Design a protein around this motif. Sequence first.
Motif, PDB file in Angstrom:
ATOM      1  N   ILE A 178       6.126  -7.111  -2.694  1.00 46.11           N
ATOM      2  CA  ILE A 178       6.030  -6.812  -4.129  1.00 46.11           C
ATOM      3  C   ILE A 178       6.951  -7.687  -4.964  1.00 46.11           C
ATOM      4  O   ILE A 178       8.008  -8.112  -4.501  1.00 46.11           O
ATOM      5  N   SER A 179       6.551  -7.927  -6.209  1.00 41.34           N
ATOM      6  CA  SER A 179       7.404  -8.595  -7.179  1.00 41.34           C
ATOM      7  C   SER A 179       7.614  -7.718  -8.392  1.00 41.34           C
ATOM      8  O   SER A 179       6.649  -7.206  -8.951  1.00 41.34           O
ATOM      9  N   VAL A 180       8.865  -7.566  -8.817  1.00 38.87           N
ATOM     10  CA  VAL A 180       9.158  -6.792 -10.021  1.00 38.87           C
ATOM     11  C   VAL A 180       9.235  -7.711 -11.240  1.00 38.87           C
ATOM     12  O   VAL A 180       8.207  -7.968 -11.857  1.00 38.87           O
ATOM     13  N   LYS A 181      10.415  -8.229 -11.579  1.00 36.28           N
ATOM     14  CA  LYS A 181      10.603  -8.888 -12.878  1.00 36.28           C
ATOM     15  C   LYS A 181      11.932  -9.654 -12.971  1.00 36.28           C
ATOM     16  O   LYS A 181      12.859  -9.125 -13.589  1.00 36.28           O
ATOM     17  N   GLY A 182      12.086 -10.876 -12.430  1.00 38.55           N
ATOM     18  CA  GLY A 182      11.056 -11.768 -11.857  1.00 38.55           C
ATOM     19  C   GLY A 182       9.913 -11.213 -11.033  1.00 38.55           C
ATOM     20  O   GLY A 182       8.862 -10.952 -11.615  1.00 38.55           O
ATOM     21  N   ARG A 183      10.021 -11.039  -9.707  1.00 37.46           N
ATOM     22  CA  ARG A 183      11.169 -11.303  -8.812  1.00 37.46           C
ATOM     23  C   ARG A 183      10.776 -10.622  -7.489  1.00 37.46           C
ATOM     24  O   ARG A 183      10.396  -9.451  -7.492  1.00 37.46           O
ATOM     25  N   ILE A 184      10.877 -11.332  -6.368  1.00 37.44           N
ATOM     26  CA  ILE A 184      10.161 -10.917  -5.150  1.00 37.44           C
ATOM     27  C   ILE A 184      10.935  -9.970  -4.221  1.00 37.44           C
ATOM     28  O   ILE A 184      12.163 -10.035  -4.119  1.00 37.44           O
ATOM     29  N   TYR A 185      10.185  -9.100  -3.540  1.00 34.86           N
ATOM     30  CA  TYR A 185      10.744  -8.104  -2.630  1.00 34.86           C
ATOM     31  C   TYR A 185       9.848  -7.865  -1.409  1.00 34.86           C
ATOM     32  O   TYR A 185       8.690  -7.468  -1.553  1.00 34.86           O
ATOM     33  N   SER A 186      10.396  -8.092  -0.217  1.00 37.06           N
ATOM     34  CA  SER A 186       9.728  -7.728   1.036  1.00 37.06           C
ATOM     35  C   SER A 186       9.821  -6.206   1.209  1.00 37.06           C
ATOM     36  O   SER A 186      10.858  -5.615   0.900  1.00 37.06           O
ATOM     37  N   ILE A 187       8.743  -5.579   1.687  1.00 44.51           N
ATOM     38  CA  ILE A 187       8.706  -4.122   1.886  1.00 44.51           C
ATOM     39  C   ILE A 187       9.073  -3.742   3.323  1.00 44.51           C
ATOM     40  O   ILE A 187       8.281  -3.951   4.240  1.00 44.51           O
ATOM     41  N   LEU A 188      10.267  -3.182   3.516  1.00 45.09           N
ATOM     42  CA  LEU A 188      10.713  -2.775   4.849  1.00 45.09           C
ATOM     43  C   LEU A 188       9.935  -1.565   5.352  1.00 45.09           C
ATOM     44  O   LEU A 188       9.412  -1.585   6.462  1.00 45.09           O
ATOM     45  N   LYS A 189       9.874  -0.513   4.540  1.00 44.17           N
ATOM     46  CA  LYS A 189       9.214   0.741   4.924  1.00 44.17           C
ATOM     47  C   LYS A 189       8.634   1.402   3.683  1.00 44.17           C
ATOM     48  O   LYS A 189       8.614   0.808   2.602  1.00 44.17           O
ATOM     49  N   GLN A 190       8.151   2.627   3.847  1.00 40.77           N
ATOM     50  CA  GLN A 190       7.807   3.472   2.716  1.00 40.77           C
ATOM     51  C   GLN A 190       8.482   4.828   2.878  1.00 40.77           C
ATOM     52  O   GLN A 190       8.105   5.621   3.737  1.00 40.77           O
ATOM     53  N   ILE A 191       9.482   5.079   2.038  1.00 42.28           N
ATOM     54  CA  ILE A 191      10.205   6.354   2.028  1.00 42.28           C
ATOM     55  C   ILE A 191       9.296   7.546   1.703  1.00 42.28           C
ATOM     56  O   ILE A 191       9.584   8.674   2.104  1.00 42.28           O
TER      57      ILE A 191
END
Length: 260
Positions: free
Chosen positions: A3-16
């Motif tokens: 996922i990317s927020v704002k910028g801005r990129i994020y790898s998804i480790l898990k889903q809480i």
Amino acid sequence: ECISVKGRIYSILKQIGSGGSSKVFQVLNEKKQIYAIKYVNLEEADNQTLDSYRNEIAYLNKLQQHSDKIIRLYDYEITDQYIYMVMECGNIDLNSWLKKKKSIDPWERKSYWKNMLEAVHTIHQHGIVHSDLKPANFLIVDGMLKLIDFGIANQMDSQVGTVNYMPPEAIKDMSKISPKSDVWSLGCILYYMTYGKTPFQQIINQISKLHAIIDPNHEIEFPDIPEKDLQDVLKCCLKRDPKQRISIPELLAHPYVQIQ
């Protein structure tokens, strides 16, 4: 995937979890630092619903600066269709951790209690009365309790909404919901940390539980323990009349919270 927020990129480790369809994730930024990202779908939200989310988002951002016992909202992006929120990532919510724990270290209970009062005092300073506190609402972040939610967003998978923590003002008042009401709930949380059950957890008929909660003849047991302050605290929060009930500023000057 990712996922990317704002910028801005994020790898998804898990889903809480799935709210849902709010959806929390364990995520990692470009520096591989761990945050929690809360997606919400606005596709089918109305005026007041939307306006409640904005409001909670609004406070969470402002109340950042007044206490570190509020969950860090680092950044957030919001459109007409969705919301993404980058947040402080905890270890485990209090409710779950308590179910695991067989019984707590006496000194750890005092620690969390301070953490709890602190966060709730803050929101009270800004004229917010949560009115629906459960252990669920607190997240252990680096061995420390943080309030993750102000109970503003009151709108949206068993049926699992307990009245075990409800104050007697709520129920008679059918006005009188105030910060004292929040004390009543916090009492129940400590009580559970103290004794094992919440005050009326043994009763199983919701309808009775209620009648019990508001009935002065019904007396809460306070089994004697080493910590007679803890007992005193417990006795003062669960006083059925708000006026008779203790306040959080007074609780912050209590020997229980102050003396070792």
